[PDB]
Design a protein around this nucleic acid. Structure first.
Ligand SMILES: O=P(O)(O)O[C@H]1[C@@H](OP(=O)(O)O)[C@@H](OP(=O)(O)O)[C@@H](OP(=O)(O)O)[C@@H](OP(=O)(O)O)[C@H]1OP(=O)(O)O
Lengths: 46, 101, 272, 442, 223, 852
RNA sequence: ACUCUGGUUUCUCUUCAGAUCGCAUAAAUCUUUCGCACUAAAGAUUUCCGUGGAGAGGAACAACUCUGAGU
C-alpha cells in the first residue's frame, strides 16, 4: 500500500496486488494438508 | 540524542490474538545523525526505487545530477536532451488529456 | 511440459522495461552492507538488532553486564572512549568487537563499485561519453616514421565490416546489470507460488519517510525471511511418488478439461 | 625460594620458547641473551644480574654477559633438569634417610604431594599410583629411554610421554627446592591429548583416566607403529582367557533350550585377550542391615570379589536381546597387577557409590588358584603385595581421591591427598573403600 | 601462598566469592594483587586450623580487600550486608542523610571518616519470603485473624531487626509489598473466589478491637 | 617424487626439470589494489594450465584465497604461492613462481613478505578505477626494494560494458593510467631507465573476468596467425602511441590522415574488442555466428546457449587463447634468478655482495652452499605444524637433511639464535595442492618442513659444518606501521596456555603482527587496522586456539615527544655515585625524523658523509654534525644522540669507553619513554657533560645503562612533553553526490579532508582525508552505512601528529567513562595508557632526578 | 570435400539425489532453554508442497543441423 499509494494515488480501496497474500496462504495450505488428510482418514476409517 | 548517546556508552561498558504488531517492536530508533537521516541512493539520477511513483521520485530527487548535466553538457547535448524531453512531455500530456475525469 | 525457456535478447530487454516498476535498479550488493542475510545472522547470534534489521530472542543465555566483578580486563578506568561502539561495528567485525562470537557469519566485504552508466536517450550511440563520466584531462618511445614497415593488403582490422554498435547493443549492456530474473537468457520455469514479487522490496532499506507501523512491518518481514533462510535444511532424498498420477491410474478418477470458475464452484459444493 | 621450574618454559614478555633464560633473582623467564633481548633489558632494569639458560643449563651474568662457573649453583640445575644415574636408579628403592628440601621440610623422594589445580585430585592419585611402581618409574626416570623413539610429524600423543617422564624426575628428585610438585604441565598435556576430556577444572573418574592414560602411554611409546611390547605392557599388561558362553533366550521352552545346546553357537569360545587391569565388581549393597551387631557398612573379602576369575564362576552378561556367560581365567600374571574395583554404578535415576568394604591382606596374596594348571607351572611367583591403593571418599558427585602408597626401603605407608602427606598405619588401609589397587608380584 | 599454591595462569580469580547484591562499582574489584592477597589470607587462616578439628571452606567464606585499588570494604554480619566506604576515598560528593547509611566518625576527633552502607542479606530476604510462604500454605482452614497475626509478627521481627537496612534495600521493599499483596489476596480469595476489583483496604488495616484484621502496612496504600 | 596430483597440461617431470635451469625461472609477485583482479588472473592461469579445473558460470572460482575467512570475506588475506609452467608467445615454456598477494592495504605487510622472495612485480590496475592508494604504496615499496616493475591494466571490459566509453576515450583512459604510473615511478625512483609503456611490452591489458589477456606483441601475433605475411614485432611496435594508419599507403605515420582516423591502438586493437563484446552482449542470437566465423571461432550449440557472461568468457578464451602476453611481459622485463640475484643480495643480505658468500650467492648456482631464505610461515589445515616458505638463493635443499636455521638476532659474534633442525619434507607450493619433491635447486620457492620451531618471522636456512661466515638476511622492512593495539585474555583463565600457544601461532602467520605482555600481565596484539585484527582474532579463535577469548576495545599506540628545550641541564650519577652524565633534550628540525626513518641518513655511513649531510641539509655546526652518536632506539631511529662535551672538560677517549653503554641506555630509554612507556619520537639528546670513572670495574654494565636511561627520562620530562597520535590517510572512492556526505562523517571524527578530486574517465571521486587512528574505529562502517554502501574507504598509517592537550596537566579532571574534549585529550591519553601498561597513576617531572 | 550412431516431444514406472534437490518456503512431534509459549528461540525426527539425475517401458513425428566418429 505505502508503495502503491505514492504520488497522485492516495488512501483508498482501489489497490489490487494479491501475489503476496495468495502465496502466504498457499504455503500455509501446503503445511496443513497432511494434517487434515490424516484427520479425515481417521474419521472415515473402516 | 546526546543523552541517548552517552547513555549508550554507559550501558555497553556497564491470551490475546494481536493482529497488528506493537510499536515497541520498532527498531532504527537511533541517536547518531549519520544513522537517523541516511543519505538515500541517487543512482546517477537515472535509477529509481521500485514500486514508488516515477514522477514523485523525479520530483523529490536531490537534483544534484541535473545540475551536473546542466553544467557539463555541451550546447548540442543540451539541445538533444531538450528535444527528447519535449517529445516525452508531449506524449505524457497526450496521455493526461486522454485520461481525464 | 513448459519446464525450460530460452529468450532472445530483445524480448528480455522489453520484459525488463515492462518490469522496471518492480525492480530497484540496483547494480551492486553494496546497497546491502551490514543489511544482508549474513549480517542478519551475525546480529541474531549476538542478540543484537540492526536499526533497519529485525530483532530475535537471544540465541544463548546472556549474563547481565552488572554481574561481572570488575576485572582488570574490563576496568573502565583504562578504557579510552572516543565514539560509542555501535552494533554495526560489532556486526562488521564480529571477532574484534565481541567477547563471545558464536555462530557468527562473516559478512561479505566491499565489492567493486559497478559504474554502469544507464542510457536514457535511445538515439544516442551505445558507446557514448555520457556527461556523468568525469571528462579526462588529456596531457613515448615511438618508432621512426621513415622506416620501411609495410602492411600487406590482406591485413585489415579484425571486424572492420562489423559495426561498432547496433540498435540493440545498449539494451544488452543494460541486461548485463539487470536483476537476477533478467540477467539470464535461458532458464527453468518456476511455480507462480515460488516467485516472490515483493521480496526485494522489503529486503532493501525502508524508505526514509514512513510511519511507525510500516517500518515494523518491514522489520517483521525481514525477521521471517531470516528465520526461513536460517532454519532451512536441504531437502531429503525421495523415491518420487506422485499422488495425482496414482489417482489417475485407478478406476475411480477420470480426466477432463474444465474452466477454473466451474471447478471452483464444484469444489465448494463438494466441500459443503 | 622463588625458583619454580614446574611450568612452561617461555619468555614472560615475548611468549617465545627460543633461548628461554630464567632470572635467578625473581624466577621469571625471559628471552635471549644478547644486547637487545628481553632478558638483557630486564637485567639492566630490575638489577637482576644472574641468569640461567633453561635449555643449555649454563648460568650467565648479562650486563657484562659472561658465563658463571660455580659448583654451588649445581643444585639449581638439578632442580631444573633432574638426572638419575643407573646406580642412583637402582639404589632409589633402597633409600631410608629423609631428604631435606631447600626450606626446612624433610621429605621422602617419590612421596611428594601434587598440587591440586582446581579439581584434579583423581589425576594426582592416578599419577602417584603409576609412580612408586619401580619398573615404570625407572623407565621414565631416564630421558634416553624414550627420547630417541620416532614420532609422526603431526602427533601430539608424545607430549604425554616426555612430560610424564619429566614429572617422574620432579617427583623422585632427592634434592628439591620444595616438598611438592605442580602437575600443571602434565595435566595440560592430558587435556590437550584427550580432546577436552579429563579436564583440570572438572574432576573425572579415576578408573577411566587410568585406563586412558595407560592406553595413551602404550600407544605413544610405540614409535610410528604398534610396538607389541612397551614398558606399559611389560609392567601392567597380562593375558586373560575369556570363556564366552552364549545363552538361549530365557523365554523359550526347555526342549528348545536344550536343542539350542547343539547349535555350536551357545558354547564356550576362545576369546583370550590381554587385560591391562582387572575390573572387580562388588556385590550389591545388602539394602536392609543385617540383624547382627555388625555395622550397616557391608564387608566382603578380597577373595570373594576375586572369584569371577577363578574359572568356574559364571557371571551373566546380557546385552540387548542377547544373553551370555562370560567365564574368565587368567593365563599370564603381569609383574604389577591392577585391580579396578567397580564402585559407581548408574541406577535408573542417579549414580550410587557402593559402600562395600573390601577385606584384603596387604602383605600376602596367592593367586595360584586362579591360574590353569598348565599356566601355574610357568609362573614361579604369584605372591602379590599391595603397593598402591586409590580410595574415593564422599558422594559420587563431590568426591575426593586419596592414595595409600607403600614406601619401599622403609616399610612405612603414606596417605597422599593433594599436598597432604600423612603416615597411615598398615592396618587401617583395608578399612577404606578401595577403588584402584596396584600389587607387586615379587 | 604462591610458593605453596602456584598459579601460573592467574586462575585465582575464577572462583572468588563476591557480593553480587551491590552494583559492580560497589563490589570488590578482582585485581590480581587483591585476589592473591585474599586467597593468601584465607589459606593462612585455614592452615592455622587442623582439618580434623574443623574445616573452613572457601565456597562458604568471603574475603574482601580494601587497598589503593579497592575503595569498598564489604562484609556480611548477623544478616547485615555492610559496605564501608571511607570519606577520603572515592566519595567526591556532598552527602545528605539517608536512612540506610551509617555515618562513622573517629571518636578522638569527632570527624566523619567513612560511610557504612547497610543492606539486608539475600539469605535473610529468602528466609522472610519462605516464612511468608509457610504462613500462606499453613493457613488452610485457619481464621484470617491468625494469618494476619503471623504476618504481623514476621513483619515486626523483620523491621525491628533490619530497621535501616529495610529502607536501604529496594529489593526487600519490593519483596514486602509483594508478600503483603499475597497475604491480602489470600484473605480476599477466602472471602470469595471471584477477584474483588478495588477491594476496600479498610477491612485489612482496621485494628482487631474495632473488628478489622489489624494488619500492619509497609507498602504505599492510598485510602 | 611419486604421488597423486591433478591433471595438468604439462608434466610434473617437466616442471622439475625447469627448476634446475635458473635461466627459465621467473619469480613474480602479483600485487595491486583491493579487488583489482589479481586472484581472478591467477585463477585464469590455473584454468589454462589445468584442464580439469573450470570456473563456475555464476561464482568466480578462486584457486588462491583458500582460507575460510578469505572465502567468506571475499578479500585476500594471505599471500598464496603458485608454481606453474606457462608457454611463451614463441611456445617456449617458462617456470613461473607467482606470489598472489592480498590487495587490501591493511595486509600490505603480506605483500612485503612476497617482495623479499621475488625478482619481479606485476602491478594490477583497474581500468575503471585507475591508480588507487595501494597501487601508489606498492609502487613505492617495489621500486624501493630494487625490483623490476610491470603493469597489468585489468578489467578493460569495464571500459566497454560499464562506462561504455568510446574506443578513443578508452585509449585516453589507458594512456592516462600509464602516464600516472610512470609519474609515480619517476617520483619514487631517481633512475629513469624503467619507463613503463605498452610499446616496450611492460604493460599488458587484461580482463580476468572474461579471460581477455593480451599485450601488443601477443595481439600482433594473433594478426600474424590470421594473416601470415605480417611480422608481429614491428606491428606491435607500431600499434601504440598516437601513430595513425594510412590504408592508401598501408603505412604508419605520426601525422593523422583525414583528420578523423583513429590511432593504431584504437583501429586495430580497441575497436575489434569493442565489436566482439558488443556482438556477444547485444547481437548474440541475430549476428553472433557471422562474427564468430569471421574470427575463426566455432562454438557448439550447447556452448552458444550459455548466458552472456559465460559466453563472453568462452569466446575470449577461444580468441586470445593462452595468456602469452603476460608471459612475454614477465620474461623480457623480469630478471631470472640468475640475472636478478646480484640486486637481491646487495639489497637484502647483511654481509653485502663484497663478501665471499655474497659473491657465491650472486651466481645462484644449484651446486653451491645452501643459503635458503624463508619469509612466510604457512599453517597446516590442522593448525599444529608450520611450513616455512621461501626461495633458495644458493645450494640445494634436500629432504631429510640437517640444516642450521638462523633467526633475526643471529650474528657472527653472537650465534645463540641459531638451531640445527632436520628438514622433514619439501613441497613445490601450488595453491590448492602441493607437489612433494626430493630436492629444490637454487632460485626456486620451497615449503621447508621441520624448521618452523626456531623461527617466528624470518629465517636464514644454511648448511651446518660450513659457511662459518654466513650472515642473516635483513628482516622484512614493512610498508606501514602496526598501530592498533588490542588486549586479549581468555574467558576461562584455566585454559590460558592454549591462547598463549595460539599467540605464538598468529605471530608466525602474520609477518607484521606484534604480540607481547605488558607490565600488568596484559597480552597485547598490534595490528594495522580493524579488518586485519578481525582476521587475526578469527585465526586465534578458530584455527590455533579453540578457546573463547575476550578482546578489549581497540586503542592506538601513542608516541612521545618534546616541543621545546629542557628548562635546566638534567643530570644523573651511577649508583656508584660516580660517572655523572649531564644532558638536555630538544626537538628535531622539520622532516629530520622523516629523513632518518626513510633511510635518507644512516649511522652506517662514515663520519665525513654523515657530517657533510647534517651540515648542508640542516645547517648543523661541524662539531655538532660530527658528534652524533646514534639514531634513536633502533637502527635509523627517529631520535638522535649527540655529545656537546668539549674535549677540554671531558676526555674523548675516556668517554668512548662508555660510549657503547651510553648508546644502549639512550636506545632503551627512547624505546620505553617516561610518559606512558611509549616510543620517544623526534627528540634530539645532547650530552652536555660526562664525568667517567677511570677504573673499568666502576663503570660499564649495569651502572651506566640505567643512569643513561634516567638522565634521558629527566631531559625528556623537563623539556615540555607531548603525545603524538597516529594519523591515518584515508582514500574514499565515492559517487559524486556522496562526496558532501563523506565530509559529514569526517566532521564527527576529527577528520580533515585534503582533496576531493574526481577520477578521470570515471563517474566517481577520490576524497582523501587525514583521520586520527584513535578516532578511526568504525569510520569505515559509519561511512558505508551513512552512504547506503556507495562510499568505500581504505585507511593506512600516515604520520604522527601531536595530541592537542598537555599530558603533564594535573589540573584536568577526567570522568571514568566520558569522551573528553580536545583541549585535554592528551591528559586522557597519558593516564589511561599509564593504567593499561600497569605503571603508577601519574608521573612527576622530578621522579628520575637525584635531588628528590 | 564423401559415409555411420547419438533425435526431439509427451506419458508412466523404478532408483539415487546435502544440489539454493527449491535464486521458494509450510505443518506436526519430541527434547532443551529461560519466560509464567501464535504473539519464542535452540536441537532432532517426520509428513506434505515439486523438482533434479539415471534407467526402463509406452506413443507422437523427425530422420543427419549439431556432437562426433569412419574419411
Ligand atoms: O490495517 P492497515 O494496513 O493499517 O490499513 C487500515 C485499513 O485496513 P483495515 O480495514 O483492515 O483496518 C485499510 O486498509 P485496507 O482495508 O484497504 O486493506 C486502509 O487502507 P486504505 O486507506 O489504503 O484503504 C488504511 O490503510 P492506510 O491508511 O495505511 O492506507 C488503514 O490504516 P489505519 O488503520 O492506519 O487507518
Amino acid at each position: 500500500y505505502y508503495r502503491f499509494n505514492t504520488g497522485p494515488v492516495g488512501k483508498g480501496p482501489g489497490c489490487g496486488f494479491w501475489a503476496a497474500g495468495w502465496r502466504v496462504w498457499l504455503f500455509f495450505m501446503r503445511g496443513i494438508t497432511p494434517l487434515l488428510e490424516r484427520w479425515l482418514g481417521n474419521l472415515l476409517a473402516r | 540524542d546526546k543523552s541517548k548517546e552517552l547513555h549508550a556508552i554507559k550501558e555497553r561498558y556497564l491470551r490475546k490474538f494481536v493482529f497488528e504488531w506493537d510499536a515497541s517492536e520498532d527498531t532504527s530508533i537511533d541517536y547518531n545523525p549519520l544513522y537517523k537521516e541516511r543519505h538515500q541512493v541517487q543512482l546517477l539520477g537515472r535509477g529509481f526505487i521500485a514500486g514508488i511513483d516515477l514522477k514523485q521520485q523525479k520530483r523529490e530527487q536531490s537534483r544534484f545530477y541535473g545540475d551536473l548535466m546542466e553544467k557539463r553538457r555541451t550546447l548540442e547535448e543540451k539541445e538533444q536532451e531538450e528535444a527528447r524531453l519535449r517529445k516525452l512531455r508531449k506524449k505524457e500530456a497526450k496521455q493526461r488529456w486522454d485520461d481525464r475525469h | 511440459t513448459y519446464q525450460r525457456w530460452q529468450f532472445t535478447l530483445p524480448m528480455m530487454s522489453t520484459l525488463y522495461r515492462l518490469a522496471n516498476q518492480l525492480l530497484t535498479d540496483l547494480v551492486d550488493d553494496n546497497y546491502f552492507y551490514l543489511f544482508d542475510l549474513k549480517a542478519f545472522f551475525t546480529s541474531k547470534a549476538l542478540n543484537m538488532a540492526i536499526p533497519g534489521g529485525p530483532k530475535f530472542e537471544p540465541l544463548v543465555r546472556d549474563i547481565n553486564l552488572q554481574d561481572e566483578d570488575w576485572n582488570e580486563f574490563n576496568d573502565i578506568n583504562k578504557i579510552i572512549i572516543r565514539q560509542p561502539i555501535r552494533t554495526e561495528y560489532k556486526i562488521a567485525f564480529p571477532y574484534l568487537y565481541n567477547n563471545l562470537p558464536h555462530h557468527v557469519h562473516l559478512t561479505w566485504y566491499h565489492t567493486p563499485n559497478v559504474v554502469f552508466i544507464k542510457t536514457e536517450d535511445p538515439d544516442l550511440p551505445a558507446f557514448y561519453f555520457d556527461p556523468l563520466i568525469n571528462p579526462i584531462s588529456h596531457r613515448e618511445p615511438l618508432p621512426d616514421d621513415d622506416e620501411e614497415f609495410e602492411l600487406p593488403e590482406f591485413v585489415e582490422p579484425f571486424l572492420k565490416d562489423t559495426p561498432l554498435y547496433t540498435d540493440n547493443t545498449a539494451n544488452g549492456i543494460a541486461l548485463l546489470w539487470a536483476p537476477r530474473p533478467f540477467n539470464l537468457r535461458s532458464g527453468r520455469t518456476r511455480r507462480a507460488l515460488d516467485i516472490p514479487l515483493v521480496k526485494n522490496w522489503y529486503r532493501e532499506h525502508c524508505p526514509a519517510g514512513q510511519p511507525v507501523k510500516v517500518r515494523v512491518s518491514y522489520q517483521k518481514l525481514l525477521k521471517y525471511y531470516v528465520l526461513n533462510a536460517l532454519k532451512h535444511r536441504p531437502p531429503k532424498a525421495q523415491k518420487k511418488r506422485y499422488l495425482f498420477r496414482s489417482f489417475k491410474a485407478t478406476k475411480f478418477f477420470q480426466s477432463t478439461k474444465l474452466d477454473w470458475v466451474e471447478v471452483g464452484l464444484q469444489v465448494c459444493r463438494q466441500g459443503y | 625460594s622463588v625458583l619454580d621450574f614446574d611450568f612452561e618454559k617461555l619468555c614472560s614478555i615475548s611468549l617465545s620458547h627460543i633461548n628461554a633464560y630464567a632470572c635467578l633473582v625473581c624466577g621469571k623467564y625471559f628471552q635471549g641473551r644478547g644486547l637487545k633481548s628481553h632478558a638483557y633489558i630486564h637485567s639492566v632494569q630490575f638489577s637482576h644480574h644472574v641468569f640461567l639458560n633453561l635449555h643449555t643449563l649454563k648460568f650467565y651474568c648479562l650486563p657484562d654477559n659472561y658465563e658463571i662457573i660455580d659448583s654451588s649453583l649445581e643444585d639449581i640445575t638439578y632442580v631444573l633438569k633432574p638426572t638419575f644415574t643407573k646406580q642412583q636408579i637402582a639404589n632409589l628403592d633402597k633409600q631410608a634417610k629423609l631428604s631435606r628440601a631447600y626450606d626446612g621440610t624433610t621429605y621422602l623422594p617419590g612421596i611428594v604431594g601434587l598440587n591440586n589445580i582446581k579439581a584434579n585430585d583423581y589425576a594426582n592419585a592416578v599419577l602417584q599410583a603409576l609412580s612408586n611402581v619401580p619398573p615404570l618409574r625407572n623407565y621414565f626416570l631416564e630421558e634416553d629411554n624414550y627420547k630417541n623413539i620416532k614420532r609422526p610429524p603431526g602427533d601430539i600423543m608424545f607430549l604425554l610421554v616426555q612430560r610424564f617422564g619429566e614429572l617422574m624426575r620432579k617427583l623422585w628428585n632427592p634434592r628439591n627446592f620444595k616438598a611438592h610438585v605442580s602437575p600443571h604441565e602434565m595435566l595440560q598435556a592430558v587435556v590437550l591429548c584427550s580432546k577436552k576430556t579429563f579436564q583440570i577444572t572438572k574432576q573425572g573418574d579415576g578408573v577411566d583416566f587410568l585406563s586412558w592414560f595407560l592406553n595413551a602411554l602404550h600407544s605413544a611409546l610405540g614409535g610410528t607403529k604398534k610396538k607389541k611390547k612397551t614398558i606399559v605392557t611389560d609392567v601392567f599388561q597380562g593375558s586373560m582367557r575369556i570363556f564366552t558362553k552364549k545363552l538361549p533366550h530365557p523365554d523359550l521352552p526347555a526342549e528348545e533350550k536344550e536343542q539350542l545346546l547343539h547349535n555350536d553357537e551357545y558354547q564356550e569360545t576362545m576369546v583370550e585377550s590381554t587385560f591391562m587391569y582387572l575390573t572387580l565388581d562388588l556385590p550389591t549393597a545388602p539394602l536392609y542391615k543385617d540383624e547382627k551387631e555388625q555395622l550397616i557398612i557391608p564387608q566382603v573379602p578380597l577373595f570373594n570379589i576375586l572369584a569371577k576369575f577363578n574359572g568356574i564362576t559364571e557371571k551373566e552378561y546380557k546385552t540387548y536381546k542377547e544373553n551370555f556367560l562370560k567365564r574368565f581365567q587368567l593365563t599370564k600374571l603381569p609383574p604389577y597387577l591392577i585391580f579396578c574395583i567397580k564402585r559407581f554404578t548408574k541406577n535408573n535415576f542417579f549414580v550410587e557409590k557402593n559402600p562395600t568394604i573390601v577385606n584384603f591382606p596387604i602383605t600376602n596374596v596367592d593367586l595360584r588358584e586362579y591360574l590353569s594348571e598348565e599356566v601355574q607351572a610357568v609362573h614361579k611367583n604369584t605372591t602379590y603385595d599391595l603397593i598402591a591403593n586409590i580410595v574415593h571418599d564422599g558422594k559420587p558427585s563431590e568426591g575426593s581421591y586419596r592414595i595409600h602408597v607403600l614406601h619401599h626401603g622403609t616399610g612405612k605407608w603414606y596417605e597422599l591427598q593433594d599436598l597432604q602427606v600423612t603416615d597411615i598405619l598398615p592396618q587401617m588401609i583395608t578399612l577404606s573403600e578401595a577403588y584402584i589397587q596396584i600389587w607387586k608380584r615379587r | 601462598y604462591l610458593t605453596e599454591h602456584p598459579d601460573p595462569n592467574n586462575e585465582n580469580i575464577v572462583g572468588y566469592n563476591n557480593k553480587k547484591c551491590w552494583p559492580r562499582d560497589a563490589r570488590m574489584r578482582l585485581m590480581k594483587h587483591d585476589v592473591n592477597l585474599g586467597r593468601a589470607v584465607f589459606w593462612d587462616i585455614k592452615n592455622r586450623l587442623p582439618r580434623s578439628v574443623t574445616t573452613v571452606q572457601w565456597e562458604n567464606s568471603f574475603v574482601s580487600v580494601y587497598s589503593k585499588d579497592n575503595p569498598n570494604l564489604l562484609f556480611n554480619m548477623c544478616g547485615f550486608e555492610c559496605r564501608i566506604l571511607p570519606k577520603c576515598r572515592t566519595s567526591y560528593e556532598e552527602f545528605t542523610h539517608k536512612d540506610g547509611v551509617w555515618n562513622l566518625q573517629n571518636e578522638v576527633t569527632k570527624e566523619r571518616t567513612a560511610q557504612c552502607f547497610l543492606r539486608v542479606d539475600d539469605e535473610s530476604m529468602q528466609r522472610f519470603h519462605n516464612r511468608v510462604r509457610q504462613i500462606l500454605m499453613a493457613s488452610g482452614s485457619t481464621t484470617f485473624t491468625k494469618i494476619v497475626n503471623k504476618w504481623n509478627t514476621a513483619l515486626i521481627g523483620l523491621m525491628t531487626y533490619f530497621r535501616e537496612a529495610v529502607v536501604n534495600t529496594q529489593e526487600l521493599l519490593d519483596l514486602l509489598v509483594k508478600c503483603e499483596n499475597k497475604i491480602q489476596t489470600r484473605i480476599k480469595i477466602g472471602l470469595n473466589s471471584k477477584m474483588p476489583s478495588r477491594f476496600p483496604p479498610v477491612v485489612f488495616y482496621t485494628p482487631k478491637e474495632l473488628g478489622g484484621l489489624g494488619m500492619l502496612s509497609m507498602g504505599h496504600v492510598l485510602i | 617424487m611419486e604421488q597423486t596430483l591433478p591433471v595438468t597440461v604439462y608434466e610434473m617431470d617437466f616442471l622439475a626439470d625447469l627448476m634446475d635451469n635458473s635461466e627459465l625461472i621467473r619469480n613474480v609477485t602479483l600485487c595491486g589494489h583491493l579487488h583489482h583482479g589479481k586472484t581472478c588472473f591467477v585463477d585464469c592461469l590455473i584454468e589454462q594450465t589445468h584442464p580439469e579445473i573450470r570456473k563456475r558460470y555464476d561464482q568466480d572460482l578462486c584457486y588462491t584465497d583458500i582460507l575460510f575467512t578469505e572465502q567468506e570475506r571475499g578479500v585476500g588475506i594471505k599471500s598464496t604461492p603458485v608454481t606453474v609452467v606457462l608457454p611463451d608467445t614463441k611456445g617456449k615454456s617458462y617456470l613461473f613462481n607467482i606470489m598472489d598477494t592480498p590487495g587490501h592495504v591493511n595486509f600490505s605487510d603480506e605483500v612485503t613478505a612476497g617482495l623479499r622472495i621475488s625478482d619481479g612485480v606485476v602491478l594490477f590496475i583497474d581500468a575503471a578505477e585507475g591508480v588507487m592508494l595501494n597501487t601508489e604504496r606498492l609502487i613505492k615499496h617495489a621500486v624501493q626494494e630494487r625490483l623490476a616493475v610491470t603493469v597489468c591494466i585489468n578489467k578493460i571490459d569495464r571500459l566497454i560494458l560499464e562506462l561504455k566509453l568510446p574506443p578513443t576515450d578508452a585509449y585516453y583512459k589507458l594512456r592516462h593510467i600509464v602516464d600516472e604510473v610512470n609519474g609515480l615511478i619517476s617520483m619514487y625512483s631517481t633512475d629513469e631507465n624503467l619507463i613503463l609503456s605498452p610499446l616496450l611490452g611492460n604493460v599488458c591489458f587484461s580482463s580476468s573476468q572474461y579471460s581477455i589477456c593480451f599485450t601488443l606483441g601477443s595481439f600482433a601475433k594473433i594478426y600474424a596467425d590470421t594473416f601470415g605475411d605480417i611480422n608481429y614485432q614491428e606491428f606491435a611496435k607500431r600499434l601504440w602511441g598516437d601513430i595513425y594508419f594510412n590504408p592508401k599507403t598501408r603505412k604508419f605515420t605520426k601525422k593523422a590522415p583525414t583528420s578523423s582516423s583513429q590511432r593504431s591502438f584504437v583501429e586495430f586493437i580497441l575497436e575489434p574488442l569493442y565489436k566482439i563484446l558488443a556482438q556477444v552482449v547485444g547481437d548474440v542470437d541475430t549476428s553472433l555466428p557471422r562474427t564468430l566465423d569471421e574470427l575463426g571461432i566455432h562454438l557448439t550449440k550447447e556452448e552458444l546457449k550459455l548466458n552472456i557472461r559465460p559466453l563472453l568468457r568462452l569466446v575470449c578464451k577461444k580468441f586470445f587463447g593462452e595468456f602469452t602476453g603476460f608471459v612475454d611481459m614477465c620474461v623480457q622485463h623480469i630478471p631470472s634468478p640468475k640475472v636478478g640475484a646480484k640486486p637481491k643480495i646487495e639489497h637484502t643480505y647483511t654481509g653485502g655482495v663484497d663478501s665471499d658468500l655474497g659473491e657465491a650467492m650472486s651466481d645462484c648456482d644449484p651446486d653451491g652452499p645452501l643459503m635458503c631464505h624463508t619469509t612466510k610461515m604457512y599453517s597446516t589445515d590442522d593448525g599444529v605444524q608450520f611450513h616455512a616458505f621461501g626461495r633458495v638463493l644458493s645450494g640445494t635443499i634436500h629432504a631429510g637433511q640437517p640444516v642450521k636455521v638462523l633467526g633475526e638476532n643471529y650474528t657472527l659474534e653472537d650465534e645463540e639464535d641459531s638451531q640445527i633442525c632436520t628438514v622433514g619434507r619439501l613441497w613445490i607450493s601450488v595453491a590448492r595442492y602441493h607437489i612433494e619433491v626430493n630436492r629444490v635447486p637454487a632460485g626456486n620457492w620451497v615449503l621447508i618442513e621441520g624448521v618452523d620451531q626456531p623461527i617466528v618471522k624470518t629465517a636464514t636456512i644454511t648448511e651446518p659444518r660450513g659457511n662459518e661466515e654466513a650472515q642473516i638476511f635483513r628482516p622484512l622492512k614493512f610498508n606501514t606501521t602496526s598501530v592498533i593495539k588490542i588486549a586479549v585474555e581468555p574467558v576461562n583463565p584455566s585454559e590460558l596456555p592454549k591462547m598463549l600457544d595460539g599467540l605464538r601461532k598468529v605471530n608466525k602467520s602474520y609477518p607484521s603482527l606484534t604480540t607481547k605482555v605488558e607490565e600488568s600481565g596484559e597480552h597485547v596484539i598490534l595490528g594495522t587496522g580493524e579488518l586485519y585484527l578481525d582476521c587475526v582474532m578469527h585465526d586465534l579463535r578458530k584455527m590455533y586456539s579453540e578457546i573463547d577469548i575476550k578482546v578489549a576495545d581497540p586503542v592506538v599506540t601513542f608516541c612521545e615527544t618534546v616541543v621545546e628545550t629542557s628548562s635546566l641541564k638534567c643530570f644523573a650519577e651511577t649508583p656508584n655515585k660516580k660517572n655523572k652524565i649531564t644532558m638536555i633534550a630538544e626537538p628535531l628540525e622539520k622532516g629530520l625524523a622523516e629523513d632518518i626513518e626513510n633511510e635518507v641518513v644512516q649511522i652506517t655511513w662514515n663520519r665525513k658523509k654523515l657530517g657533510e649531510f647534517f651540515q648542508t641539509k640542516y645547517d648543523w655546526d661541524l662539531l655538532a654534525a660530527r658528534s652524533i652518536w646514534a639514531f634513536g632506539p633502533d637502527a635509523t631511529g627517529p631520535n638522535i644522540l649527540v655529545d656537546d662535551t668539549l674535549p677540554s672538560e671531558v676526555d674523548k677517549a675516556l668517554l668512548g669507553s662508555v660510549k657503547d653503554s651510553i648508546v644502549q641506555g639512550f636506545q632503551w630509554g627512547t624505546r620505553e619513554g617516561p610518559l606512558c612507556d611509549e616510543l620517544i619520537r623526534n627528540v634530539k639528546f645532547k650530552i652536555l657533560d660526562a664525568v667517567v670513572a677511570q677504573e673499568p670495574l666502576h663503570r660499564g654494565g649495569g651502572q651506566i645503562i640505567p643512569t643513561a636511561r634516567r638522565v634521558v627520562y629527566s631531559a625528556f620530562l623537563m623539556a615540555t612533553p607531548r603525545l603524538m597520535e597516529p594519523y591515518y590517510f584515508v582514500e574514499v572512492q565515492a559517487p559524486a553526490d556522496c562526496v558532501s556526505a563523506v565530509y559529514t562523517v569526517l566532521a564527527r571524527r576529527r577528520g580533515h579532508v585534503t582533496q576531493d578530486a574526481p577520477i578521470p574517465g570515471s563517474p566517481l571521486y577520490t576524497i582523501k582525508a587525514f583521520i586520527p587512528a584513535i578516532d578511526s574505529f568504525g569510520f569505515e562502517t559509519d561511512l558505508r552505512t551513512h552512504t547506503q554502501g556507495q562510499a568505500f574507504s581504505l585507511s593506512v598509517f600516515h604520520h604522527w601528529q601531536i595530541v592537542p592537550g598537555d599530558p603533564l596537566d594535573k589540573s584536568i579532571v577526567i570522568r571514568p567513562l566520558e569522551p573528553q574534549p580536545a583541549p585535554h585529550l592528551a591528559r586522557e591519553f597519558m593516564i589511561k595508557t599509564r593504567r593499561r601498561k600497569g605503571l603508577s597513576e601519574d608521573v612527576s617531572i622530578s621522579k628520575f632526578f637525584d635531588d628528590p
